[PDB]
PDB file of C-alpha atoms in Angstrom:
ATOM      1  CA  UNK A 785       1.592  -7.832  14.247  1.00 24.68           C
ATOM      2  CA  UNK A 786      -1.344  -7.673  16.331  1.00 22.85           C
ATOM      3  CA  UNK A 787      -4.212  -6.978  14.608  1.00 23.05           C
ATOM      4  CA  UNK A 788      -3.020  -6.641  10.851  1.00 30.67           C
ATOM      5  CA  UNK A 789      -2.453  -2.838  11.628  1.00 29.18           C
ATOM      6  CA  UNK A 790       1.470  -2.963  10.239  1.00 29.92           C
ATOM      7  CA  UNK A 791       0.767   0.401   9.620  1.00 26.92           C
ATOM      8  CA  UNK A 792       0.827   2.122  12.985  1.00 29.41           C
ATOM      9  CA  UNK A 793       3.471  -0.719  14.241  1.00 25.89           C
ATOM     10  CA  UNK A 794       5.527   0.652  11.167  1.00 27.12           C
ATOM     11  CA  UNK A 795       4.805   4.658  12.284  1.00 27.78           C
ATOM     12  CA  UNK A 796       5.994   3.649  16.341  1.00 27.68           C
ATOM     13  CA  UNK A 797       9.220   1.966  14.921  1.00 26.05           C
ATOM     14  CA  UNK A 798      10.794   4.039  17.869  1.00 24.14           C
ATOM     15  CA  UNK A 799       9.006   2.742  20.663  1.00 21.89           C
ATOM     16  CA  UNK A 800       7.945  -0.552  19.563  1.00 21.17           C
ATOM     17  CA  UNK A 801      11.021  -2.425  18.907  1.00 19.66           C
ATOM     18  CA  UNK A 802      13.580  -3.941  20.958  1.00 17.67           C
ATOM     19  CA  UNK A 803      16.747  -6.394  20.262  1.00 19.50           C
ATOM     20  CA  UNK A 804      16.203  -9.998  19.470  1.00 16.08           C
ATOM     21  CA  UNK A 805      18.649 -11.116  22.801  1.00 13.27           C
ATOM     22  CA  UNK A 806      16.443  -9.056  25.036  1.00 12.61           C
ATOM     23  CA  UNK A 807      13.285 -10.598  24.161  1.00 11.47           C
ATOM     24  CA  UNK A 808      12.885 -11.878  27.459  1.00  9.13           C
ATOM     25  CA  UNK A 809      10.704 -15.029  25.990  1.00  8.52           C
ATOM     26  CA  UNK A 810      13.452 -15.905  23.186  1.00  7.19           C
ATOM     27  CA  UNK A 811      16.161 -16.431  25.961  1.00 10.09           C
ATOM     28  CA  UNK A 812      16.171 -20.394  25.308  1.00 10.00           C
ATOM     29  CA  UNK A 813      14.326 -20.797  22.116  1.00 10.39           C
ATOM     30  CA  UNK A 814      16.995 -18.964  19.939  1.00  7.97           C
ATOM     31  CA  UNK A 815      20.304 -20.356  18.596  1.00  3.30           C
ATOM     32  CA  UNK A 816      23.165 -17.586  19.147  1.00  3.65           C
ATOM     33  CA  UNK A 817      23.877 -17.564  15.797  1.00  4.53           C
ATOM     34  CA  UNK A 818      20.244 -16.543  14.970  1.00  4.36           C
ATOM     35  CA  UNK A 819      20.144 -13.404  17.196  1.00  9.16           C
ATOM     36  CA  UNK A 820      23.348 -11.670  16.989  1.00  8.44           C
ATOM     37  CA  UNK A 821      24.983 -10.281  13.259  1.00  8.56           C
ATOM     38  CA  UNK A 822      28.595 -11.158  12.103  1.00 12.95           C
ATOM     39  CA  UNK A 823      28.745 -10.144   8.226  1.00 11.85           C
ATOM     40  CA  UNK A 824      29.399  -7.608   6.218  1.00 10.36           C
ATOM     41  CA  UNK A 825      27.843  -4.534   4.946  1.00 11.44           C
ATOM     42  CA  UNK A 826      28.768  -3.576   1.435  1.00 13.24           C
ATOM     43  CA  UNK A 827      29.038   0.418   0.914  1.00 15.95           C
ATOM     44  CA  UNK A 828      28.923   1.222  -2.720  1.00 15.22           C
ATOM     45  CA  UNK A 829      28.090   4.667  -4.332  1.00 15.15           C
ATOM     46  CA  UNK A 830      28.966   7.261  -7.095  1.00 17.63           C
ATOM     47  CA  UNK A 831      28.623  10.557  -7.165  1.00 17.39           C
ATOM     48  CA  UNK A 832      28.320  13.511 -10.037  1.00 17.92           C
ATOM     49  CA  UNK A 833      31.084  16.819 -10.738  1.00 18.54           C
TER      50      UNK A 833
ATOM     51  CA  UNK B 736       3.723  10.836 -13.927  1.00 17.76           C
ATOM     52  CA  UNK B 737       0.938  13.386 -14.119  1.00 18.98           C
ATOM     53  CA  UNK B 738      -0.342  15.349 -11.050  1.00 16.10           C
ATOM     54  CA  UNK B 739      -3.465  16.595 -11.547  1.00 17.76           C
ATOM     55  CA  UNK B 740      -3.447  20.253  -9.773  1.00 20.33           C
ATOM     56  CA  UNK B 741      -5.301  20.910  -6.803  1.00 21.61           C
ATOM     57  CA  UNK B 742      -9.264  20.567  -7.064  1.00 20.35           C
ATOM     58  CA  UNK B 743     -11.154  23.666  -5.773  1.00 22.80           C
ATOM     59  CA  UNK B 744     -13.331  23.777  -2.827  1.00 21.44           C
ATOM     60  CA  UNK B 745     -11.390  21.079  -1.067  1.00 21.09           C
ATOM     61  CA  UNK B 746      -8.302  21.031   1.446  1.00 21.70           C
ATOM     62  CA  UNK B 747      -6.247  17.697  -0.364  1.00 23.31           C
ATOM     63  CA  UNK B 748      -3.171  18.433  -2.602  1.00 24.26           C
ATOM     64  CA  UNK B 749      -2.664  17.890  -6.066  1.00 22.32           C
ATOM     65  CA  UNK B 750      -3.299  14.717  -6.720  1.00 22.80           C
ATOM     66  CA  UNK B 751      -0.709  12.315  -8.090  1.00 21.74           C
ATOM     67  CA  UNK B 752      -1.605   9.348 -10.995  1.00 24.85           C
ATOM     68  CA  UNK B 753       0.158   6.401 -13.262  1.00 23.07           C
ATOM     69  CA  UNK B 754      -1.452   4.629 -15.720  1.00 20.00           C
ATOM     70  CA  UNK B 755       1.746   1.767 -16.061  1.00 20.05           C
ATOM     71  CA  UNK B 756       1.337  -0.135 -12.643  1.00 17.33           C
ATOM     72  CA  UNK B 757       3.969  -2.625 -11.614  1.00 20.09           C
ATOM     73  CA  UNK B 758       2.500  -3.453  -8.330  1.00 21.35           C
ATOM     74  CA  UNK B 759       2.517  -6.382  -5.991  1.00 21.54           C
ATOM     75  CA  UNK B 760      -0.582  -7.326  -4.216  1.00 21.89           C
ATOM     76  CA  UNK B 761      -0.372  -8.361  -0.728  1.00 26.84           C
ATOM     77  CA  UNK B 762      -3.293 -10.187   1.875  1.00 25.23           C
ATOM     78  CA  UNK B 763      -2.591  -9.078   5.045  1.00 24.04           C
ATOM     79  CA  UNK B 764      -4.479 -11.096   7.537  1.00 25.54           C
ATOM     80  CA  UNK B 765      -6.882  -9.741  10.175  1.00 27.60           C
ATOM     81  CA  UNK B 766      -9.845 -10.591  11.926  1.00 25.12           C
ATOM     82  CA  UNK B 767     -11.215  -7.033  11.208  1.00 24.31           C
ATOM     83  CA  UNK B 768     -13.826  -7.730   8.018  1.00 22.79           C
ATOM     84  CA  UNK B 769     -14.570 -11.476   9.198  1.00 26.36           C
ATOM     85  CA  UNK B 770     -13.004 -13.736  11.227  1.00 25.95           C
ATOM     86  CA  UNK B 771     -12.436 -16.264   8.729  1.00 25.68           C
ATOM     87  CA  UNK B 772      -9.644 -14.152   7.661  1.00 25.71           C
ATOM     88  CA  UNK B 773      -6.730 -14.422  10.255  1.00 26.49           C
ATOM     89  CA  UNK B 774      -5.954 -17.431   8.097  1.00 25.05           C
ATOM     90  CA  UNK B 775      -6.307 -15.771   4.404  1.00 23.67           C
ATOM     91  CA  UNK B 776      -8.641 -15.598   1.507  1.00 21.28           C
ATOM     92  CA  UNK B 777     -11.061 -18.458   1.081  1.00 20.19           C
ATOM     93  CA  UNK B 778     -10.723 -20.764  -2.112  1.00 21.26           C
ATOM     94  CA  UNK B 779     -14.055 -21.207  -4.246  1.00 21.77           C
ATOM     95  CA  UNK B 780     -15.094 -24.013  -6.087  1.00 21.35           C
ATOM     96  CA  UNK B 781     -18.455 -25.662  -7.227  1.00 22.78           C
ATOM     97  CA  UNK B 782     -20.606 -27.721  -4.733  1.00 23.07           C
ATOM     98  CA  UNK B 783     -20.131 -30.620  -6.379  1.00 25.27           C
ATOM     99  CA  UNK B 784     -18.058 -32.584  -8.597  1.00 26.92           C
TER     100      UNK B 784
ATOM    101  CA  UNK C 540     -15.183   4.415   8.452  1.00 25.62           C
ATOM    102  CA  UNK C 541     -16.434   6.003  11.742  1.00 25.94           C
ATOM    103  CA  UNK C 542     -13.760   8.198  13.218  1.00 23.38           C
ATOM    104  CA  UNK C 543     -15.034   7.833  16.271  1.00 25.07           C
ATOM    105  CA  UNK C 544     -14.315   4.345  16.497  1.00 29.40           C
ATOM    106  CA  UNK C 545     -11.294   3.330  14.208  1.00 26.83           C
ATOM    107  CA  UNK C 546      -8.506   5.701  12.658  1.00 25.30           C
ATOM    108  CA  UNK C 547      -7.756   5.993   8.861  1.00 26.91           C
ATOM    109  CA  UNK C 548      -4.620   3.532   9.018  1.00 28.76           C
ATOM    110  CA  UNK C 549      -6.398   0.753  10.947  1.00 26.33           C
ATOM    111  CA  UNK C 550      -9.556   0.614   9.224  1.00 23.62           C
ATOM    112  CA  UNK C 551      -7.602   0.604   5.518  1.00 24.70           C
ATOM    113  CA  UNK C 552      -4.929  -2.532   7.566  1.00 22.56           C
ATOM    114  CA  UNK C 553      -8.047  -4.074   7.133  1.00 19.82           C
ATOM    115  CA  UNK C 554      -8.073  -5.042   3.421  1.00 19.44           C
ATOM    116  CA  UNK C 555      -4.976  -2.591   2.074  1.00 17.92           C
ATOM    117  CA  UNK C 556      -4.979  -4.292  -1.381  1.00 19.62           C
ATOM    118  CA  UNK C 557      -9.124  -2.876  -1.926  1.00 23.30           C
ATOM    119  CA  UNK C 558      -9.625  -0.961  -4.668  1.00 21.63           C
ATOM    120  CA  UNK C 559     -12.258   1.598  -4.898  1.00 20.16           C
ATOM    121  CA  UNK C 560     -13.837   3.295  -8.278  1.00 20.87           C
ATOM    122  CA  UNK C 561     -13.367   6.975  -8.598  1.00 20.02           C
ATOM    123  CA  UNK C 562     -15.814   9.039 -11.239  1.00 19.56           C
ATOM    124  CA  UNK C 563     -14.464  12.364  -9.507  1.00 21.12           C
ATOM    125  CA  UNK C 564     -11.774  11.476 -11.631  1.00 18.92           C
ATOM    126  CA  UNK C 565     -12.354  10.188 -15.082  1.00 19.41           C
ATOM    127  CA  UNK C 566      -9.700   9.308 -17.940  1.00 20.47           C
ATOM    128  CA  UNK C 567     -11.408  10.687 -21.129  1.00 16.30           C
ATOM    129  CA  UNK C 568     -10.031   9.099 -24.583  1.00 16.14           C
ATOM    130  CA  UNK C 569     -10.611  10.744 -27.506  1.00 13.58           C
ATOM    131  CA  UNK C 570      -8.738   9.824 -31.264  1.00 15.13           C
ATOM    132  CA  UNK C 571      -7.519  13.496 -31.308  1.00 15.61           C
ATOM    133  CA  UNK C 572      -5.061  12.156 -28.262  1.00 15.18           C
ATOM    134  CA  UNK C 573      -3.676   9.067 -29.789  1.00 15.76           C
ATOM    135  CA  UNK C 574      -3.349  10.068 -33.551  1.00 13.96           C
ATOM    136  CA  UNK C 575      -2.686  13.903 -32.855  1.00 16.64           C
ATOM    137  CA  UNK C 576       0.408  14.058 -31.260  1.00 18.79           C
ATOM    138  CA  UNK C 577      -0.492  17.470 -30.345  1.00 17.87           C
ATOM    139  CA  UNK C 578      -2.663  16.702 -27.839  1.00 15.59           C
ATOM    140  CA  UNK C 579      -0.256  14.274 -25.911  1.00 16.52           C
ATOM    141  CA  UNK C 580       1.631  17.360 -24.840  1.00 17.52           C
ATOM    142  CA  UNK C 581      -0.799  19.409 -23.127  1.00 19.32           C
ATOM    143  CA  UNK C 582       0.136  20.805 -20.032  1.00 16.70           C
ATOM    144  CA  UNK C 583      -2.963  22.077 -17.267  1.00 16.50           C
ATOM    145  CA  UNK C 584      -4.783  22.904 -20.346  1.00 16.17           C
ATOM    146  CA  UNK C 585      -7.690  25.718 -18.994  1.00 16.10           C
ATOM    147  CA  UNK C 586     -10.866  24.148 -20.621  1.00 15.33           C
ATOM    148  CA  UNK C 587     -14.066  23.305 -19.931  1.00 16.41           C
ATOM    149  CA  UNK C 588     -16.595  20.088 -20.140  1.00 14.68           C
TER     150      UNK C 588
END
């Protein structure tokens, strides 16, 4: 966050973001288990008639 | 909830007001207003003991 | 803020927890409201003040 504008970083989600592993800086600085996801997701939901 | 309709003479929307607030105040830091505050919000005390 | 200068979402990054007074809009409390139950009902009541 550059400037404090989270804002307009938050509108241009779509442009400004990229993966953790790509990050060409974080290619030594990062454990593997800090930059790739291996858990669950739970789905839970009802519904009406 | 209560929105207040539209107010004449001007292109907003009806406006939209709470009088319970559960909110969660936040400093985001920026150099912006001063430059003091990249760090946060100062802490005041007296001059002297 | 200028618009020429900063937009609407980077000048309020700047301090987003501010608060601001607003006498456009006003909150008027009257005994009718509280002890009339009547009166705690009205819906975009035509009057005049």
């Amino acid at each position: 966050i550059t400037d404090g504008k989270i804002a307009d970083l938050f509108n241009n989600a779509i442009s400004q973001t990229i993966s953790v592993d790509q990050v060409q800086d974080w290619l030594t600085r990062i454990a593997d288990t800090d930059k790739y996801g291996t858990e669950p997701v739970s789905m839970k939901y009802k519904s009406n008639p | 909830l209560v929105r207040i309709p539209a107010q004449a003479n001007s292109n907003l929307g009806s406006l939209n007001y709470y009088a319970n607030i559960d909110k969660v105040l936040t400093f985001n830091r920026s150099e912006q207003i001063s430059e003091i505050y990249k760090n946060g919000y100062l802490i005041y005390t007296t001059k002297d003991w | 803020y200028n618009p020429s200068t900063t937009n609407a979402k980077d000048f309020v990054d700047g301090s987003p927890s501010e608060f601001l007074v607003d006498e456009n809009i006003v909150t008027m409390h009257s005994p009718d409201v509280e002890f009339d139950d009547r009166l705690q009902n009205i819906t975009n009541g035509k009057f005049k003040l």
